[PDB]
């Protein structure tokens, strides 16, 4: 039914221009160097650029529509490493943003003492470098289906490392930090004129962590089920499910913008000003 | 061209050293939290500052809970304050020490608070309201000679709020008077301000051992609200 | 006797008004309507000077037009090299609050002030190579607003005590006090002849004083609110003042009269700093509404906007050779406009 | 005494200000025009300067 | 120049009505917020009442609540304080002060030192 055709083109046309816009807005902001969260937001926007561009366009258009005649040795298995590094970069830019939010909310006084823009650049480039360095063993990634698979001893360890590095650790630490923030800002006595205060922050934090968990769970569950188990190899059940599970990750990566940047009114006003700036 | 090259290298080395020194100072400037004291002429500014020093501009340095604060008490200046008050925009909180026993200057204190709250460079700073001289207020109300209703006609049609938290040894009349002053300040505080800055009322005396903790809680809440507004959490 | 004194004061005031009316004839705008309009002036940003931690109140371009000084409430008196964007010096002030900065024509001394009521003077060319307090001037009462260097030995300083005092750094004494203002005097500018200067107070008055005789030669009035920006015309027979009522005036010394009002309906924010160019067609004035304006001094028409700043623009300085202008705002940024 | 002294200072200052030679303001306007037109060429801000002379670009 | 001249004010026994008229010139009357300030013999300065630009934001001091009536006529550049039911404590000098900055709701105009933007005041004796 051309589900990839109808879905991935829309995903590109929705995510890529919006993330380019937020990149150009955040790059030229004067207050970008004054405060730290905008640097992480720009990093996440750039990670979105790499993820959507490389994965959605290059891989899941070229090798799925007009390619896979490509020799797998050098080019395909280098582009796969690049895609995996992009995904890891997106997740491990999301993580430090959550840590910074937790610090700035639970410990308002020491936020500037423990977080400063000089450390922000170090931690914003170290994650990129370590993702690119840690993705180089993903060169030997198990080609899915194809003529034969063979349960090579590197396949299970690669899958387990990918799971622990994309879902298991980030989701657990998001759960812990968001639960701590919610408990601290709900149990402690806040201002009297703050009736519509705890509900909004609790809903936002919990919906962020819940949408991340629910949009990245199927892929991990599926790859673990493929590593273990005794699949029946029904082409519909094992491959259409594979496609629907793989599309949810890119859906999450695309909606990360709507979750983070679009919510803030200070960004909505800038977008409104800049949409008519060219004319 | 050698002279130009070595001059450029010397300038670059000096610039690098200045960058290092400025970063080292930057590690200090944000650590301290700036404070400012404002109020009437006879308000207990220097009394509170001197009292908690143990724990022109008359500065003071103190650290509590592993973070330090800096309080500014200008007293070597004139009584016209529309020009040097713009300097204190980048201040974490403003402490408004106010007279509570002398009701003659209460109107002037309210006008001063109204000017600060509605100021078009001080509309971001949270204001800490210290109702100083509570013991003298209790002594004056119990005496009954002052006739608090003379200075404020609408005090007669007033009752203690439902959320009042009087001390066990207090009197309904004195708690009524202090909460009346508190509400008179808060009605000015509440009338303007769309959540940008918050006013916290606090019943404090000059010789009080917990004056630092009140400022701690006020500053913590103010910075928490500022960070929440800064983030998407609003 | 007091009633008679008030009556004769009013008589002299209306006599002065009648003299001004007799010396009116025609307006400058009517007789200068034949000038070719300058048109749009597009000034971009050349280099951004970002090394400060707090807001900036005072800057002063050097005589060599190569290096400039800046102020910050952290306590820094950084001397910048605009051509290379290199910080050649960084002076840690004793008092965190500084509002005035002056650069000596000799290039060896840099001044600072603030709420400390101290006009500290720092020397640069020293054997040990480290900056230090040359002299600690004291004697003022109000907040110190604007100081300027007459020469290497004398400076004129304005404070919040309604007085302007001329000092002697060598002996550290107040040679003459100019006590004629009602409100806080904020900005003063030095004429090219270094013998007369004009000071602006918070009483909508501009007073032209005589440096030698130490008296107010004449006074200028016509603003509605307090004025905090003032600057001599290069010729020395005119000067512009910027008040808080979103108006810029241009009083001439010889005629004691207002010439134009540089204001617009859509401007509601007050002027902070003003600075003429090296010719006269260019009158730059700072503003509170996160930008700067470039007025034409001969037609009262807006020509160009130096937008690109956050918070309040609190200073404005044009180089002696007129190559560029620097606008520092509260965002701890200094921008060079060509 | 203080009020009388202040009034005396004010009246003497204003009478000093009154005894000042006034000049026709159109002559001042002509002088301003002459000085402004006589230095248009040397102004870098008014007339744009080539990038070779300007050291900021 | 900015001139603030007050009109009216005479010896009136307790009771009666007095109309204090403020003459304003040299500035736009509508933009600026104005107020009245008193000066009792042997005491300092105090604030009486103030009105905003439109005149619908009237406020009064604690001492007098219904005994005064402050209003403005922006067309004729005049400020009035209709006073009645006087008391012997109101034997002060009334100055027609004006807040410095146009288009704002904050002003510091109770200074003991000679505030620039206010008149000499008219004496009222009860
Ligand atoms: N009994 C009592 N006395 C107090 C209290 N607070 C201040 N005082 C007294 O009030 C007097 C004046 O207080 P100050 O702090 O010195 O006033 P100030 O701020 O310095 O006034 P300025 O000259 O304008 O700077 C002091 O001698 C204190 O003893 C209080 O809470 N209770
Ligand atoms: C490029 C990568 N593409 C792939 O990972 C293709 N392989 C699988 O989906 C798969 C499924 C079950 C078991 C195993 Cl071991 C692998 C990818 C990247 C982002 C989203 C989706 C896909
Ligand atoms: Mg004091």
H/E element, C303: strand C302-305
Let me know: does C217 contact C208? Beta carbons within 8 Å.
yes
Query: Furthest-apart CA pair in chain D: how many Å?
Result: 68
**CB proximity list for B10: less than 8 A, separation 6 or greater:** none
Let me know: does C54 contact C114? Beta carbons within 8 Å.
no
Q: Measure in Å the smallest separation between the Cα of B43 and chain A Cα atoms.
A: 27
Kindly report the number of other CB atoms within 10 A of residue A170's CB atom: 21
Task: Count CA atoms closer than 13 A to B121's CA, side-chain side.
Answer: 22
Residue A87 alpha carbon, nearest atom of ligand 2: 19
Let me know: does E115 contact E63? Beta carbons within 8 Å.
no
In the DSSP assignment, the letter for residue C290 is: S
**CB proximity list for B195: less than 8 A, separation 6 or greater:** B225, B229
Q: Measure in Å the smallest separation between the Cα of D29 and chain C Cα atoms.
A: 6
Identify the bridge partners of residue C154 per DSSP, sorted by sequence position.
C168
Protein residues with CB under 6 Å of any ligand 1 atom: B 41-47, 75, 132-133, 135-136, 205-206
A80 Cα: distance to centroid of ligand 2 (angstroms): 10
Strand order in the sheet with C67-70: C59-61, C67-70, C79-81, C86-89
Phi, psi (deg, nearest 5) at residue B17: -65, -40
3-state helix, strand, coil in chain B (%, to 5): 45, 15, 40
Q: Phi-psi category of C256—alpha, beta or left, where left has phi over 0 and alpha has psi -120 to 50?
A: left
Instruction: Tell how far CA C3 is from the center of its chain.
Output: 39
Cβ neighbourhood burial of E15 (10 Å; 0-12, 13-18, 19+): exposed
- Closest CB to C324 among D10, D28, D56: D56
- Closest CB to B151 among E62, E104, E112: E62
Q: How many domains does chain D have?
A: 1
C156 Cα: distance to centroid of ligand 2 (angstroms): 76
Listing DSSP states for chain A in one string gives: --HHHHHHHHHHHHHHHHHHHHHHHHHT-GGGTTSSHHHHHHHHHHHHHHIIIIIIIIIIIIIIII-S-S-IIIIIHHHHHHHHHHHHHHHHHHHHHHHHHHHHHH-STTHHHH--HHHHHHHHHHHHHHHHHHTGGGGG----SSS-----HHHHHHHHHHHIIIIIHHHHHHHHHHHHHHHHHHHS---TT-TTTHHHHHHHHHHHHHHHHHHHHHHHHHHHHHHSS-----HIIIIIHHHHHHHHHHHHHHHHHHHHTTT-HHHHHHHHHHHTT--
H/E element, C103: strand C101-103
H/E element, E84: strand E78-84
Cβ contact A31–C331 (<8 Å) = yes
Contacts 24+ apart (CB under 8 A), A67-72: A72/A143
Instruction: Tell how far CA A149 is from the center of its chain.
Output: 28
Sequence ranges of the domains in chain E:
3-120
Let me know: does C199 contact C162? Beta carbons within 8 Å.
no
Let me know: does C160 contact C125? Beta carbons within 8 Å.
no
To the nearest 10°, report the CA torsion of C273, C278, C282, C288.
-10
A246 Cα: distance to centroid of ligand 2 (angstroms): 7
Q: Can you tell me the distance from the alpha carbon of E97 to that of E117, in angstroms, rounded to the nearest whole number? A: 6
Rounded to a whole number of angstroms, the distance between the first and last alpha carbons of chain E is 33
Q: Can you tell me the distance from the alpha carbon of B30 to that of B25, in angstroms, rounded to the nearest whole number? A: 9
Q: Can you tell me the distance from the alpha carbon of B56 to that of B65, in angstroms, rounded to the nearest whole number? A: 29
Let me know: does E112 contact B81? Beta carbons within 8 Å.
no
Q: At B68, which CATH number?
A: 3.40.50.300
Write out the two tokens for C117: 């009521």
**CB proximity list for A188: less than 8 A, separation 6 or greater:** none
Interface of C with D in 2-21 (CB under 8 A): 2, 5, 8-9, 12-13, 15-16, 19
E108 Cα: distance to centroid of ligand 3 (angstroms): 19
Let me know: does A238 contact A144? Beta carbons within 8 Å.
no
SS3 A224: helix
B99 Cα: distance to centroid of ligand 1 (angstroms): 9
| B81: chain E residues, CB-CB within 8 Å | 108
Where in the sequence is the domain holding B108, given as residue range(s)? 1-230
Identify the bridge partners of residue C294 per DSSP, sorted by sequence position.
C284
Identify the bridge partners of residue B129 per DSSP, sorted by sequence position.
B96, B201
Q: Can you tell me the distance from the alpha carbon of B163 to that of B179, in angstroms, rounded to the nearest whole number? A: 10
Q: How many domains does chain B have?
A: 1
Let me know: does D36 contact C305? Beta carbons within 8 Å.
no
Residue with tokens 């964007």: C85
Of C148, C167, C163, residue with least CA distance to C201: C163
**CB proximity list for A125: less than 8 A, separation 6 or greater:** none
Phi, psi (deg, nearest 5) at residue A244: -70, -30
- Tell me the residue length of chain C: 338
Q: How many helices (H) and strands (E) does chain B have?
A: 7, 6
The runs of H, that is alpha helices, within C23-159 are 28-31
Task: Count CA atoms closer than 13 A to C168's CA, side-chain side.
Answer: 8
Let me know: does C18 contact D22? Beta carbons within 8 Å.
no
**CB proximity list for A71: less than 8 A, separation 6 or greater:** none
Listing DSSP states for B44-73 in one string gives: SHHHHHHHHH---B--EEEEETTEEEEEE-
Torsion sign, CA atoms C28, C29, C34, C37: positive
Residue B47 alpha carbon, nearest atom of ligand 1: 15
Looking at domain C1-337, what is its CATH homologous superfamily? Answer: YVTN repeat-like/Quinoprotein amine dehydrogenase (2.130.10.10)
Q: Can you tell me the distance from the alpha carbon of B177 to that of A22, in angstroms, rounded to the nearest whole number? A: 55
Kindly report the number of other CB atoms within 10 A of residue A273's CB atom: 10
CATH entry 2.60.40.10 includes domain E3-120: yes
H/E element, C61: strand C59-61
CA angle B49, B54, B55 (to 5 degrees): 95
- Closest CB to C226 among E1, E100, E120: E100
**CB proximity list for A78: less than 8 A, separation 6 or greater:** A139
To the nearest 10°, report the CA torsion of B51, B57, B63, B69.
120
Residue with tokens 């060598």: C170
Q: Which residues of C276-315 are buried (b: 16+ CB within 10 A; e: fewer)?
A: bbbbbbbbbbbbbbbbbbbbbbbbbeebbebebbbbbbbb
| C221: chain E residues, CB-CB within 8 Å | 1
Let me know: does B93 contact B128? Beta carbons within 8 Å.
yes
Let me know: does C273 contact C288? Beta carbons within 8 Å.
no
Could you tell me if B158 lies within 8 Å of chain E, comparing CB atoms? no
Phi, psi (deg, nearest 5) at residue C17: -65, -40
Q: Can you tell me the distance from the alpha carbon of E79 to that of E7, in angstroms, rounded to the nearest whole number? A: 10
Of B22, D56, B9, B15, residue with least CA distance to C87: B15
Let me know: does C27 contact C33? Beta carbons within 8 Å.
no
Cβ contact E102–C245 (<8 Å) = yes
Identify the bridge partners of residue C110 per DSSP, sorted by sequence position.
C103, C122
Cβ contact C255–D23 (<8 Å) = yes
SS3 A272: helix
CA angle C55, C58, C63 (to 5 degrees): 140
Q: Can you tell me the distance from the alpha carbon of C154 to that of C150, in angstroms, rounded to the nearest whole number? A: 5
In the DSSP assignment, the letter for residue A76 is: I
Phi, psi (deg, nearest 5) at residue C122: -110, 135
Cβ contact C268–E103 (<8 Å) = yes
Phi, psi (deg, nearest 5) at residue E3: -125, 135
Q: Can you tell me the distance from the alpha carbon of A247 to that of C235, in angstroms, rounded to the nearest whole number? A: 73
Of E45, E57, E38, residue with least CA distance to E96: E38
| D39: chain C residues, CB-CB within 8 Å | 234, 278-280
Q: Can you tell me the distance from the alpha carbon of B148 to that of B140, in angstroms, rounded to the nearest whole number? A: 9
State the best of D45, D48, D49 to mutate against chain C, taking most chain C CBs within 10 Å: D45
Phi, psi (deg, nearest 5) at residue A38: -65, -30
State the best of B66, B194, B218, B231 to mutate against chain A, taking most chain A CBs within 10 Å: B231
SS3 A186: helix
Instruction: Tell how far CA C314 is from the center of its chain.
Output: 11
**CB proximity list for C85: less than 8 A, separation 6 or greater:** C47, C49
Let me know: does E33 contact E105? Beta carbons within 8 Å.
yes
- Tell me the residue length of chain D: 57
Where in the sequence is the domain holding D34, given as residue range(s)? 1-57
Write out the two tokens for C188: 């003063």
**CB proximity list for C194: less than 8 A, separation 6 or greater:** C150, C151, C211
Kindly report the number of other CB atoms within 10 A of residue E75's CB atom: 8
Query: Furthest-apart CA pair in chain C: how many Å?
Result: 67
SS3 C28: helix
Resolution of the entry in angstroms = 3.3
CA angle A230, A232, A237 (to 5 degrees): 120
Residue with tokens 């109101």: E90
Q: Measure in Å the smallest separation between the Cα of C333 and chain A Cα atoms.
A: 9
Q: Which protein residue's CA is at the shortest distance from atom 11 of ligand 2?
A: A223
**CB proximity list for E71: less than 8 A, separation 6 or greater:** E51, E55, E79, E80, E82
Torsion sign, CA atoms A170, A175, A181, A184: negative
Nearest CA in chain C to E31: C245
Q: Can you tell me the distance from the alpha carbon of C334 to that of C68, in angstroms, rounded to the nearest whole number? A: 10
Instruction: Tell how far CA A236 is from the center of its chain.
Output: 28
Torsion sign, CA atoms C105, C108, C113, C116: negative
Q: What is the CA radius of gyration of chain A?
A: 21
Of B88, B144, B76, B74, residue with least CA distance to B116: B88
């Amino acid at each position: 039914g051309f589900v990839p055709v109808v879905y991935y083109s829309l995903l590109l046309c929705l995510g890529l221009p919006a993330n380019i816009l937020t990149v150009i807005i955040l790059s030229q902001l004067v207050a970008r160097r004054q405060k730290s969260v905008y640097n992480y937001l720009l990093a996440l926007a750039a990670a979105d650029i790499l993820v959507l561009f490389f994965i959605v366009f290059v891989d899941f258009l070229l090798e799925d529509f007009i390619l896979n005649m490509q020799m797998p040795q050098v080019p395909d298995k280098i582009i796969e490493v690049l895609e995996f590094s992009s995904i890891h970069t997106s997740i491990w830019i999301t993580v430090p943003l959550t840590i910074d939010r937790y610090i700035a909310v639970c410990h308002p006084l020491k936020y500037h003492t423990v977080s400063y823009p000089a450390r922000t650049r170090k931690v914003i480039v170290s994650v990129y470098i370590t993702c690119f360095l840690t993705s180089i063993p993903y060169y030997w990634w198990p080609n899915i289906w194809t003529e034969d698979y063979i349960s090579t001893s590197v396949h299970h360890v690669l899958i387990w490392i990918h799971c622990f590095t994309v879902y298991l650790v980030p989701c657990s630490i998001f759960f812990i930090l968001n639960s701590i923030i919610v408990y601290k800002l709900r149990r402690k006595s806040n201002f009297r004129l703050r009736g519509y205060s705890t509900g909004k922050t609790t809903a936002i934090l919990f919906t962020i962590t819940s949408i991340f968990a629910t949009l990245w769970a199927p892929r991990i569950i599926m790859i673990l089920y493929h590593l273990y188990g005794a699949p029946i190899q029904n082409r519909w059940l094992v491959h259409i499910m594979s496609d629907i599970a793989n599309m949810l990750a890119l859906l999450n990566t695309a909606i990360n913008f709507f979750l983070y940047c679009f919510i803030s009114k200070r960004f909505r006003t800038m977008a409104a000003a800049t949409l008519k700036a060219f004319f | 061209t050698e002279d130009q090259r070595n001059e450029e290298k010397a300038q670059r080395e000096a610039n690098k050293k200045i960058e290092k020194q400025l970063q080292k100072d930057k590690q200090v400037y944000r650590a301290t939290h700036r404070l400012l004291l404002l109020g009437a002429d006879n308000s207990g500014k220097s009394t509170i500052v001197k009292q908690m020093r143990i724990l022109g501009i008359f500065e003071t340095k103190f650290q509590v809970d592993k973070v330090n604060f800096h309080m500014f008490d200008v007293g070597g200046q004139r009584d016209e304050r529309r020009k040097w008050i713009q300097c204190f925009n980048d201040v974490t909180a403003i402490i408004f020490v106010v007279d509570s026993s002398d009701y003659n200057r209460l109107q002037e204190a309210l006008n001063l608070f109204k000017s600060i709250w509605n100021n078009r460079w001080l509309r971001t700073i949270s204001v800490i309201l210290f109702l100083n001289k509570q013991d003298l207020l209790a002594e004056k109300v119990l005496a009954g000679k002052s006739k608090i209703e003379d200075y404020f006609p609408e005090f007669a049609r007033y009752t203690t709020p439902e959320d009042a938290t009087p001390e066990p040894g207090e009197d309904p009349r004195v708690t009524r008077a202090k909460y009346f002053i508190r509400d008179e300040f808060l009605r000015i505080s509440t009338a303007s301000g769309d959540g940008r800055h918050y006013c916290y009322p606090h019943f404090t005396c000059a010789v009080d051992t917990e004056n630092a903790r009140r400022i701690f809680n006020d500053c913590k809440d103010a910075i928490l609200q500022m960070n929440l507004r800064e983030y998407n959490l609003v | 006797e007091l009633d008679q004194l008030r009556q004769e004061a009013e008589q002299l005031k209306n006599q002065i008004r009648d003299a001004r009316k007799a010396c009116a004839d025609a307006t400058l705008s009517q007789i200068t309507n034949n000038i070719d309009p300058v048109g749009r002036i597009q000034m971009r940003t050349r280099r951004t000077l970002r090394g400060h931690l707090a807001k900036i109140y005072a800057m002063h371009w050097g005589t060599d037009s190569r290096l400039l000084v800046s102020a910050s409430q952290d306590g820094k008196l950084i001397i910048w090299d605009s051509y290379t964007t290199n910080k050649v010096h960084a002076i840690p002030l004793r008092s965190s609050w500084v509002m005035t900065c002056a650069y000596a024509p000799s290039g060896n001394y840099v001044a600072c002030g603030g709420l400390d009521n101290i006009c500290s003077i720092y020397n640069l060319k020293t054997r040990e190579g480290n900056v230090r307090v040359s002299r600690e001037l004291a004697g003022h009462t109000g907040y110190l607003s604007c100081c300027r260097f007459l020469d290497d030995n004398q400076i004129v300083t304005s404070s919040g005590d309604t007085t302007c005092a001329l000092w002697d750094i060598e002996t550290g004494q107040q040679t003459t006090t100019f006590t004629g203002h009602t409100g806080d005097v904020m900005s003063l500018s030095l004429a090219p002849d270094t013998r007369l200067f004009v000071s602006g107070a918070c009483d909508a008055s501009a007073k032209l004083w005589d440096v030698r005789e130490g008296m107010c030669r004449q006074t200028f009035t016509g603003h509605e609110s307090d004025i905090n920006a003032i600057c001599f015309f290069p010729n020395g027979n005119a000067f512009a003042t910027g008040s808080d009522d979103a108006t810029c005036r241009l009083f001439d010394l010889r005629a004691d009269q207002e010439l134009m009002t540089y204001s617009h309906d859509n401007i509601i924010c007050g002027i902070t700093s003003v600075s003429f160019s090296k010719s006269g067609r260019l009158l730059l004035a700072g503003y509170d509404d996160f930008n700067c304006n470039v007025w034409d001094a001969l037609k009262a028409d807006r020509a160009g906007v130096l937008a690109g700043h956050d918070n309040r623009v609190s200073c404005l300085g044009v180089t002696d050779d007129g190559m560029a202008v620097a606008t520092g705002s509260w965002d701890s940024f200094l921008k060079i406009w060509n | 005494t203080a009020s009388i002294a202040q009034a005396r200072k004010l009246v003497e200052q204003l009478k000093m200000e009154a005894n000042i030679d006034r000049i026709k303001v159109s002559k001042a306007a002509a002088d301003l025009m002459a000085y402004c037109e006589a230095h248009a060429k040397e102004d870098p801000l008014l007339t744009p300067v080539p990038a070779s002379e300007n050291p900021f670009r | 120049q900015v001139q603030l001249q007050e009109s009216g004010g005479g010896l009136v026994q307790p009771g009666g009505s007095l109309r204090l008229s403020c003459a304003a010139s040299g500035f736009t009357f509508s933009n600026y917020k104005m107020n009245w300030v008193r000066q009792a013999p042997g005491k300092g300065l105090e604030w009486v009442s103030d009105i905003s630009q439109s005149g619908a934001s009237i406020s009064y001091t604690g001492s007098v609540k219904g005994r005064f009536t402050i209003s403005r006529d922006n067309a004729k550049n005049t400020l009035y304080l209709q006073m009645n039911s006087l008391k012997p404590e109101d034997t002060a000098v009334y100055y027609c002060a004006r807040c410095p900055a146009p288009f704002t709701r904050d002003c510091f105009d109770v200074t003991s030192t000679t505030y620039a933007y206010r008149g000499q005041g008219t004496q009222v004796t009860v």
